[PDB]
Design a protein around this ligand. Structure first.
Ligand SMILES: Nc1nc2c(ncn2[C@@H]2O[C@H](COP(=O)(O)OP(=O)(O)OP(=O)(O)O)[C@@H](O)[C@H]2O)c(=O)[nH]1
Ligand SMILES: Nc1nc2c(ncn2[C@@H]2O[C@H](COP(=O)(O)OP(=O)(O)O)[C@@H](O)[C@H]2O)c(=O)[nH]1
Lengths: 316, 431, 430
């Protein structure tokens, strides 16, 4: 529901470099719920192990989110993790593979087969917008050469990203092609070790309309999928000023997000939304009629030991 | 870092700035005509924090003076600081917004903010280790409001990496005369709470009360209100402006002062606010100055401290004393006044000590506080904004100059969240 | 002869540094012109360059400078050589993310290279004295980084830390436990032996013991300096053992994690009692166990005692020294903990204390510095524990520190190790 926020963690398996080079497997699973990572337990909703299926994952996690987006609520899904953590496979996977495909092509599938199930009373009209936050400002992931967008609260006092390209989307292929031009236009940075380093939190909003010709009611369904960048120790990376500018921006907004989840998880007094620009756009998505899933993406390798830790320590 | 740059925004921003400058000049031993006629080299030393150099003996204030229509620049050039300002830094313009915030941030001011962006860029590119902008800002005016905010926004877009420290005049709904003020203030705050780093709020009624009742000036003229703003603007810069005992910088204040990031509406205060006379001596000796500073109505915004609570409080002492009261009275006043200070911040009071007092005086204090009572000031502005907006009043002002209904609503909704936010930390506690 | 580099960083660690070196100037007889006037050989801390110029091994490191200005223009300008005066520019006062990460990066090399250079000019290196403001912004952000460096760049030589952990009352940052926690996590790995410094007891002591009114930090630095200087006197001045840095470490804290000791100096007294009575070797040693006279105002009454190392500097009689300690050890009902074996380690040096031309202590004869470790530091660690959780549960301030350069993870990790460190000081029993 709203109250029960699905904090999940999903460990990838070890890779042939991690297996041959021999950074070991950290986890000691207590259960479905709880894992021991290096001395300290971390309890969550669901710890998916490295032996889990994409189908099991999606159906426990994602499938009900979509039904609820559809049936009267909105939904959020958050994906948190660093480069090579296994975020690619969890959030996207590979669409030609019916096993291998993840959260975004499975949502495109159950959304469009929700379309192809019902008949001509609901008028399904999906619009999508794709935008990144990069050095404070909101860049449009679709349309090139903008400075900032305006994220306006309406008469219902809900944030609409004004200035963005909304894509009136009609085919599940069109959904997908969108991601590809989008991801191409992203601010990723390439270093020598860190190749696809994500320097933007990116918000994908699938606005599913379904307004009934019959019952006349204005039926809708906003799904926010938020691509969360990974939290970076500049003691670790050692970088330059311009790359540190990014890394503090990430860390700040991430941490501010955890303060709202903490205040949401508390059910506190103010429950902030205003100060972080991300929590501003996701004002109602954090704190409203939202069924919300946080998918944590970690390595079980001893390379990324303090990264897993730092990430798991999120969930309060 | 080193160089603070100063910006005078609004007819008052000009005035209160020019007095600030008058003070700091006199303080570092510079004549308001031009020359360093000064004695103390220690008081000379860190001049570049505010001043630009010039012909060796003259020092140039690194001011940017913003005013929409002409005439204000003419008043300051006319004034006894006059010639100490370099005429390039008179950033005047032609046509006016006349209080109207929309007219200011959208319409008119657009021609001038390229100009100003040029000038501040020039002085910022002029600097060694750029510290921050300290902007004297008529919060509910038009030149200060809509243009000063438009500028803050250009300044922020340009420099995230510098300290945007504002001194922001927002008087009460009791003594104020500017009509559309409740609109100008909401629109201005909607930019400020998003944009600025540390906003030190100031009230003319509080300055009036300080003069009339605490100090006992007969007629509180503007330059009198300036005497007190300039003193606290002088206060807050003190420790980086001179060598002392302890810390310096305004960020070292601010990092301590703001517990969550939008709680940046500060309340300064000054002391000795003693009537001019002989006893005086049996008003305050040294420890007793702290007892004055910690007292109720001494504050540049008039917050009755029984009415809210405090978050972080800091205190800039100027004069050659010990942390004796900073040991003793800061303990005892947090012990006894326990109701006032929020118990979630482990020991709330944050003192520095600078050796140099104000020129001629012996011990001064600057209070710098985050008073949760500040939200009543916002509550009434938000009321009056609701009233005017609910009436649909002043269309032939704002909406004519292109203000949007969503951005009215937003600024309101932001201001009410600011209220709810400052109020939650009033409410908030320890275990 | 065995050459000890004193590094001092922070507002206070610099200031206090300056007083340390001013009493070392006076103890060793250097005039502010640079010149030793007569025949002595204090080449530990000082060195004569060729002309009559004794240059210290004092490394002043700072941000935007205060004291270095006052030093090279005015205060022993002709003693301190400008190459050893390391100024900085950008800001981090309070802010640990700007300290240990951002501005620390821009600093480190210019500082480190200067250190490697002085340590090149130290031929017979004894090791480091590192003086720093532990909870401070100017201090600990960069010094925790500097120690991280010198743990490799120096290797097996020891870092003798003096660590200003704040008073339960006098508190100039709000975020001083955030500093100190992160600072502790760092020194837990990269410091050799850590002398926890206060403000409170020290000020308490000036009013109770010293009986001057409520003095300025200048006089109070002249208190600390007396205490640092007595520690170093045993290297500086000739006499018994306790020359090595390792001679403290090894003697004090042989349990590897338990590396913060405490200390005190005596006689601290009034010029009145100086005239009025003459203190005996027993009475100064009885002042060594005195609870009110102890350096960090953590309570020795509620605490139990661990190791005890006593440095006597003055003409003392070793029998009477053996008796003072024998008797007071035998007699006082203080718990010497059952984990420690029984015994003090004593140290008697010829040279008496030296007094400053100031407004401070008078010309006493015989003098002692108690080094100890006691369980009472856990009380100090309790304030950290209380105070941290009090903001952290709130998540106050985190927009300044995690927002500007720190990672949030790092806060919990240090919370866990500090807490295990309280379990370390709780492993003090049988
Ligand atoms: N004994 C002593 N204490 C001092 C002196 N100067 C400051 N202190 C205080 O003792 C503690 C030392 O911290 P600081 O040195 O001020 O911390 P800092 O490194 O300057 O940290 P920032 O102010 O954040 O840059 C503070 O609470 C000071 O107020 C001094 O000369 N001696
Ligand atoms: N403290 C102070 N207040 C003043 C002074 N002169 C005018 N005021 C008041 O403070 C506000 C100044 O507004 P102004 O600077 O005119 O706003 P602008 O329209 O943006 O130029 C008004 O409400 C004035 O009555 C002065 O020198 N000092």
């Amino acid at each position: 529901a709203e109250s029960n926020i699905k904090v999940m963690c999903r460990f990838r398996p070890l890779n042939e470099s991690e297996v041959n080079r021999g950074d070991k497997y950290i986890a000691k699973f207590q259960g479905e719920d709880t894992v021991v990572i290096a001395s300290k337990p971390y309890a969550f909703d669901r710890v998916f192990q490295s032996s889990t299926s994409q189908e099991q994952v999606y159906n426990d996690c994602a499938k009900k989110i979509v039904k609820d987006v559809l049936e009267g609520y909105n939904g959020t899904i958050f994906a948190y993790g660093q480069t090579s953590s296994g975020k690619t496979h969890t959030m996207e996977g590979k669409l030609h593979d019916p096993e291998g495909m993840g959260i975004i092509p499975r949502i495109v599938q159950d959304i469009f087969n929700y379309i192809y199930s019902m008949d001509e009373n609901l008028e399904f009209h999906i619009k999508v917008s794709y935008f990144e936050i990069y050095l404070d400002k909101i860049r449009d992931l679709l349309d090139v050469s903008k400075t900032n967008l305006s994220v306006h609260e309406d008469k219902n006092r809900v944030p609409y990203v004004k200035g963005a390209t909304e894509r009136f989307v009609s085919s599940p292929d069109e959904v997908m092609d969108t991601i590809d031009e989008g991801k191409s236009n992203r601010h990723v940075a390439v270093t020598n070790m860190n190749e696809h380093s994500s320097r933007s939190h990116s918000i994908f909003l699938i606005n599913v309309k379904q307004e009934n010709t019959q019952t006349e009611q204005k039926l809708s369904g906003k799904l926010y999928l938020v691509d969360l960048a990974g939290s970076e120790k500049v003691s670790k990376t050692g970088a330059e000023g311009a790359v540190l500018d990014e890394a503090k921006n990430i860390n700040k907004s991430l941490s501010a997000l955890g303060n709202v989840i903490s205040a949401l998880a508390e059910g506190s007094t103010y429950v902030p939304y205003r100060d972080s620009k991300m929590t501003r756009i996701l004002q109602d998505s954090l704190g409203g009629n939202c069924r919300t899933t946080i998918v944590i993406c970690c390595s079980p390798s001893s390379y990324n030991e303090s990264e897993t830790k730092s990430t798991l320590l999120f969930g309060q | 870092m080193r160089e603070i740059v100063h910006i005078q925004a609004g007819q008052c921003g000009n005035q209160i700035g020019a007095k600030f400058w008058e003070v700091i000049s006199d303080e570092h031993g510079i004549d308001p005509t031009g020359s360093y006629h000064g004695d103390s080299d220690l008081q000379l030393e860190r001049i570049n924090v505010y001043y630009n150099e010039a012909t060796g003996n003259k020092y140039v204030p690194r001011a940017i003076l913003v005013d929409l229509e002409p005439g204000t620049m003419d008043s300051v050039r006319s004034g006894p600081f006059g010639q100490i300002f370099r005429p390039d830094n008179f950033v005047f313009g032609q046509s006016g917004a006349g209080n109207n915030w929309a007219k200011g941030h959208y319409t008119e001011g657009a021609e001038l903010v390229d100009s100003v962006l040029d000038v501040v860029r020039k002085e910022s590119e002029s600097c060694d280790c750029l510290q921050g902008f300290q902007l004297t800002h008529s919060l509910g005016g038009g030149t200060g409001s809509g243009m000063g905010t438009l500028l803050i926004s250009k300044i922020r877009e340009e420099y995230p990496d510098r300290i945007m420290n504002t001194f922001s005049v927002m008087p009460s709904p009791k003594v104020s005369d500017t009509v559309v003020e409740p609109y100008n203030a909401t629109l201005s705050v909607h930019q400020l709470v998003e944009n600025t780093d540390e906003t030190y709020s100031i009230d003319n009624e509080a300055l009036y009360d300080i003069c009339f009742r605490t100090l006992k000036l007969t007629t509180p003229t503007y330059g009198d209100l300036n005497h007190l703003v300039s003193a606290t603007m002088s206060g807050v810069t003190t420790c980086l402006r001179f060598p002392g005992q302890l810390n310096a910088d305004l960020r070292k204040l601010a990092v301590n002062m703001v517990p969550f990031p939008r709680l940046h509406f500060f309340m300064p205060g000054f002391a000795p606010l003693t009537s001019r006379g002989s006893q005086q001596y049996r008003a305050l000796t040294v420890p007793e100055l702290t007892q004055q500073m910690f007292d109720s109505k001494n504050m540049m915004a008039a917050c009755d401290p029984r009415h809210g609570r405090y978050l972080t409080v800091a205190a800039i002492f100027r004069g050659r004393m010990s942390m004796k009261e900073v040991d003793e009275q800061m303990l005892n006043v947090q012990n006894k006044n326990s109701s006032y200070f929020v118990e979630w911040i482990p020991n709330n009071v944050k003192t520095a000590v600078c050796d140099i007092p104000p020129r001629g005086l012996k011990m001064s204090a600057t209070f710098i506080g985050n008073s949760t009572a500040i939200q009543e000031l916002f509550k009434r502005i938000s009321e009056q904004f609701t009233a005017m907006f609910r009436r649909k009043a002043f269309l032939h002002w704002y909406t004519g100059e292109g203000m949007d209904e969503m951005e009215f609503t937003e600024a309101e909704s932001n201001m009410n969240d600011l209220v709810s936010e400052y109020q939650q930390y009033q409410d908030a506690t320890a275990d | 002869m065995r050459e000890c580099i004193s590094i001092h960083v922070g507002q206070a660690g610099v200031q206090i540094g300056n007083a340390c070196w001013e009493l070392y100037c006076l103890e060793h007889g250097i005039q502010p012109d640079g010149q030793m006037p007569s025949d002595d050989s204090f080449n530990t801390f000082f060195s004569e360059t060729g002309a009559g110029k004794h240059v210290p091994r004092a490394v002043f490191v700072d941000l935007e400078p205060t004291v270095i200005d006052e030093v090279r223009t005015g205060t022993y300008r002709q003693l301190f050589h400008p190459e050893q005066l390391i100024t900085g520019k950008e800001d981090a006062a309070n802010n640990y993310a700007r300290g240990h990460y951002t501005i620390g990066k821009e600093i480190i090399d210019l500082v480190l290279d200067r250190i490697r250079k002085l340590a090149d000019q130290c031929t017979g290196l004894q090791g480091f004295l590192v003086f720093h403001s532990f909870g401070g912004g100017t201090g600990s952000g960069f010094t925790s980084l500097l120690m991280e460096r010198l743990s490799v760049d120096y290797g097996k030589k020891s870092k003798l830390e003096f660590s200003i952990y704040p008073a339960p009352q006098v508190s100039t940052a709000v975020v001083e436990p955030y500093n100190s926690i992160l600072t502790t996590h760092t020194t837990l790995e990269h410091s050799d032996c850590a002398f926890m410094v206060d403000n409170e007891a020290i000020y308490d002591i000036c009013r109770r013991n010293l009986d001057i009114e409520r003095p300025t930090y200048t006089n109070l630095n002249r208190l600390i300096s007396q205490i640092v200087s007595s520690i170093t006197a045993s290297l500086r001045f000739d006499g018994a053992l306790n020359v090595d840095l390792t001679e403290f470490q090894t003697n004090l804290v042989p349990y590897p994690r338990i590396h913060f000791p405490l200390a005190t100096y005596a006689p601290v007294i009034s010029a009145e009692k100086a005239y009025h009575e003459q203190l005996s070797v027993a009475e100064i040693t009885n002042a060594c166990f005195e609870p009110a006279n102890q350096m960090v105002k953590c309570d020795p009454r509620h605490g139990k005692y661990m190791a005890c190392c006593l440095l006597y500097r003055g003409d003392v009689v070793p029998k009477d020294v053996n008796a003072a300690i024998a008797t007071i050890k035998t007699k006082r009902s203080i718990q010497f903990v059952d984990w420690c074996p029984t015994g003090f380690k004593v140290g008697i040096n010829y040279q008496p204390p030296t007094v400053v031309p100031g407004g401070d202590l008078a010309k006493v004869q015989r003098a002692v510095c108690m080094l100890s470790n006691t369980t009472a530091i856990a009380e100090a660690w309790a304030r950290l524990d209380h105070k941290f959780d009090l903001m952290y549960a709130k998540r106050a301030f985190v927009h300044w520190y995690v927002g500007e350069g720190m990672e949030e993870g790092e806060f919990s990790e240090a919370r866990e190790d500090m807490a295990a460190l309280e379990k370390d000081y709780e492993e003090v029993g049988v």
